[PDB]
Design a protein around this ligand. Structure first.
Ligand SMILES: Clc1ccc(Nc2nc(NCc3nc4ccccc4[nH]3)nc(N3CCOCC3)n2)c(Cl)c1
Ligand SMILES: [Mg+2]
Length: 519
């Protein structure tokens, strides 16, 4: 077998308007997926949607549609974005799918039988419009009476909160506390970034874990608890098991599950990392199922006003960006501007600057300079590579291998903006190499055609290296670079083709008519 690799994005909630940060997750998952497939893994890459709850019932009803009708339309639009981003997801899990709903049912009923889930009462500070409960310390403008909390406001919307008591099934999770802590100890790389682990052991595990209310009686649109249909499965169990339902767990064909579980990486935004680090492995322990090998939270893409939403007036539509500026530009900015363990920022100015200077100038003009010259000096015939003939070739070819080495180390540690900048260090140095070798000077001396060709050989081989490294990130530039150069063998486009510098042992006819990589 190709060794398997299973990567996931969270399931998105179909409110209707998607930012660059929802886009960030799918694009990054895609970079990981494309990269793993290039390394020879049997990849499965999952995304999908969280389709249940009170808020969808309401959305549907305002739009004047049934839930499904409303849902199908939100999802058509979601899947359209991911097609337009060229997300290489192998499947798309909808929580409204029988395959998912059947898992939810069975999972719930089993934890009931085991005695992990019990009937009690939830009490909390509820916000009607937010469809969300808040802790006393999360309240804004709290109201006190003789030292006791009596009311306050939602920190999201600022609507008044109201104390609600309600009947809930509860999943007893603190019973798995010491196992979880042992699982963290035996799996040190589990939580990425790892600085995220202690804040969580501190803030959430050691206080320690409260029983989790996992159903409600207050909505209809959702998976009903079979032994008790008045109760509907709340977000925790419904959303998490997306990752195992998509694989045919507990169906009649569990081959995908047997093949791909456990996941190698759950990728997520930081707001739900706690849920995937604590609740999720505990639920898996309760099901006697293997735990995922890694969970990775990325930061947010912020503005100058500051975090991104419909409300502040700071929403950026990935869609218009692809249209305005091109696909490769958009994918590039997102991956290039979000460091591991940090938030990033969208400025229209920063965007155009990164697209112009990195992509169009550094890369695009290296390619056009190089073809122009092969066409001026050799009428389109690129002399086959020979060896490191020029004083600078030996350390430049070393730099090419060092580029690939340092890129791979960044790709494995999830440090994408660093893998990209490393490639661009090599990009720039290849541009420097034209200035250094001044081919036009060589071109005037007939006894220098060998060296001229050596210089050209290097430039192209340097371009080819950068195109291969960029393939997980950019779905257009690399292919269009290989065509322009008339590198037409699929093998010369793979990672293995980078182990030894100078791979074009025969003459090739670069394009007569080179156009911009980035228009
Ligand atoms: Cl893969 C994945 C994706 C998301 C999440 N978390 C997550 N999602 C959502 N979505 C909206 C939402 N509301 C829902 C109601 C019923 C069923 C599914 C519902 N989904 N809402 C929350 N809330 C946490 C507490 O405040 C209120 C909402 N948490 C998890 Cl744990 C896993
Ligand atoms: Mg009822």
């Amino acid at each position: 077998a190709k060794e398997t690799f299973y990567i996931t994005t969270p399931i998105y909630y179909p409110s209707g308007n998607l930012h660059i940060g929802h886009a960030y997750s799918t694009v990054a998952g895609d970079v990981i997926a494309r990269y793993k497939r290039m390394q020879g893994y049997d990849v499965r890459y999952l995304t999908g949607t969280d389709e249940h709850g009170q808020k969808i019932q309401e959305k549907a009803q305002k739009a004047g549609k049934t839930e499904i009708e409303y849902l199908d339309e939100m999802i058509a639009g979601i899947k359209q974005l991911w097609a337009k981003l060229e997300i290489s997801n192998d499947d798309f899990i909808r929580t409204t799918e029988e395959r998912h709903k059947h898992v939810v049912e069975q999972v719930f009923e089993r934890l009931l039988k085991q005695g992990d889930i019990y009937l009690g009462e939830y009490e909390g500070w509820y916000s009607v419009p937010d469809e969300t409960y808040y802790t006393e310390s999360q309240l804004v403008d709290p109201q006190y009476e003789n030292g006791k909390i009596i009311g306050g406001k939602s920190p999201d919307s600022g609507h008044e909160v109201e104390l609600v008591k309600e009947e809930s099934y509860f999943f007893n999770i603190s019973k798995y506390t010491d196992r979880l802590l042992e699982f963290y100890d035996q799996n040190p790389d589990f939580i990425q970034p790892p600085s995220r682990k202690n804040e969580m052991i501190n803030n959430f595990i050691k206080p320690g874990l409260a029983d989790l209310a996992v159903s409600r009686t207050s909505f209809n649109w959702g998976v009903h608890v079979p032994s008790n249909p008045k109760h509907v499965v709340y977000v925790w169990i419904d959303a998490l098991v997306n990752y195992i339902s998509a694989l045919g767990y507990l169906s009649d064909d569990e081959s995908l599950f047997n093949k791909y579980w456990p996941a190698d990486i759950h990728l997520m935004a930081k707001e739900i990392v706690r849920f995937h680090s604590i609740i999720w492995p505990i639920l898996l322990m309760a099901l006697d199922l293997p735990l995922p090998k890694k969970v990775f939270a990325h930061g947010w893409i912020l503005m100058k006003d500051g975090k991104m939403s419909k409300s502040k007036g700071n929403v950026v539509d990935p869609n218009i960006l692809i249209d305005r500026y091109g696909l490769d530009a958009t994918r590039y900015y997102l991956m290039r501007e979000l460091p591991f363990g940090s938030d990033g920022v969208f400025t229209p100015e920063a965007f155009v600057e990164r697209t112009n200077f990195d992509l169009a100038n550094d890369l695009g003009n290296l390619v056009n300079r190089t073809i122009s010259m092969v066409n001026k000096y050799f009428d389109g015939e690129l002399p086959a590579y020979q060896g490191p003939l020029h004083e600078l070739d030996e350390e430049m070819e070393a730099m090419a291998l060092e580029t690939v080495k340092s890129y791979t180390e960044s790709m494995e540690s999830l440090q994408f903006s660093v893998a990209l900048s490393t490639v661009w260090k090599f990009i720039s140095r290849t541009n420097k190499y034209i200035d250094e070798t001044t081919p036009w000077v060589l071109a005037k001396d007939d006894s220098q055609k060998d060296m001229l060709g050596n210089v050209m050989a290097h430039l192209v081989e340097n371009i080819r290296y950068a195109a291969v490294l960029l393939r997980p990130f950019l779905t257009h530039a690399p292919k269009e670079i290989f065509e322009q150069l008339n590198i037409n063998n699929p093998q010369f486009m793979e990672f293995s083709s980078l182990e030894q510098y100078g791979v074009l042992t025969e003459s090739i006819m670069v394009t007569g008519q080179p156009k911009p990589i980035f228009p």
